[PDB]
Ligand SMILES: O=C(O)Cc1ccc(O)c(Cl)c1
């Protein structure tokens with residue numbers, strides 16, 4: 001039920017939509033191709049059967065920002081017009097299933113539970129972005145990075161000996177995209193955390209040596 | 220079906236839920252009372268039958284921010300736990316209707332259209348906050364105040380003579396709450412826009428003398 005998200009990646013997946021894909025339209029996308037073209041008006045939920053999509057917002061002046069990443073069993077909830085210009089691209093070969101409003105009616109008539117999984121998915125997203133705005137108005141850049149690593153360890157940290165391991169690739173670029181923080185500050189904070197023997201943000205893994213001090217510093 | 224919003228106030232109203240409130244639980248709140256108490260686990264959608272609610276988030280250090288205002292026909296979508304601490308107060312006497320998951324099944328088994336109205340309401344909320352995150356990572360505080368005014372004018376501004384008039388109560392305080400800007404910046408921007416002959420943020424109205432400039 002739990003509709004929390006720490007990072008804007010794989011928001012509340014709904015594997016069970018796989019059972020309904022013959023009610024929608026299968027559309028495939030080569031690596032680097034546009035799932036949602038800039039300016040295109042989308043009026044379908046887009047279910048990600050397999051692959052990976054990066055979904056950005058583009059402003060009036062052409063400026064572009066990450067909204068989220070999506071992988072297998074993710075849902076793009078763009079059933080109605082929103083006034084935002086979205087650009088979504090396939091990061092690898094990607095199979096999607098596009099569900100119109102009418103096709104969704106057929107889904108819910110078959111399985112009423114699908115309704116509530118989609119509410120979960122929407123709610124996850126609201127809670128994540130609403131919190132993020134508030135947090136950006138409350139904590140400074142270094143604090144946001146520390147709060148991110150703390151929350152991530154608290155959530156996903158697996159006790160390996162005297163440490164917690166977070167088994168994920170989280171690049172410096174992505175931490176910047178997520179936190180809004182510029183690259184030099186991201187570099188500097190990561191480097192201190194490692195020099196202070198607190199955490200070591202590696203390529204394929206984050207090792208937290210001293211979670212109590214990360215928590216303390218995040219405050 | 221338009222799911223845009225400029226102001227985090229009265230997100231996508233669903234007046235038709237008025238038809239189904241006998242399927243939920245009616246709860247009234249006096250002015251100043253908590254609809255959602257800080258630290259309360261909410262597992263209900265809450266429909267606002269009449270009145271007005273200010274809905275905030277609270278962080279672990281007790282610091283607090285506005286998420287949104289809500290009036291008649293508004294929906295609070297907190298059906299499941301989110302991990303956020305939410306405090307929602309009645310700004311005037313307010314009648315609410317709480318829908319559990321169970322009761323929402325009853326509603327949807329009666330009228331399938333209500334599922335899509337709820338999707339519209341959620342979508343409007345995701346589109347609002349997601350844009351705002353990105354906006355905050357792209358544009359400095361002053362530019363976000365100027366974007367607020369321009370967007371407001373070209374959606375709601377009625378072309379009256381030489382100027383542009385937007386009929387709404389938008390206080391300096393709430394301009395800050397929305398844009399994330401400190402009160403002193405908001406004053407020093409607004410008193411500029413009047414002095415330059417571009418905008419006047421009077422109490423009840425907003426008069427844009429030059430939209431091209433804005
Ligand atoms: O990934 C698949 O399920 C099939 C698929 C989809 C999209 C593509 O561009 C390719 Cl090469 C294959």
Ligand SMILES: O=C(O)Cc1ccc(O)c(Cl)c1
Pocket residue numbers: 055067075076077078082083084085086122125342345346349
């Ligand atoms: O399309 C929008 O404006 C925002 C958005 C983007 C992607 C999604 O999955 C959702 Cl629910 C909304």
Ligand SMILES: O=C(O)Cc1ccc(O)c(Cl)c1
Pocket residue numbers: 123126127130274286294295296297301302303305341344
């Ligand atoms: O509960 C949250 O975490 C955020 C939130 C608040 C109010 C709402 O109406 C929704 Cl859909 C989400």
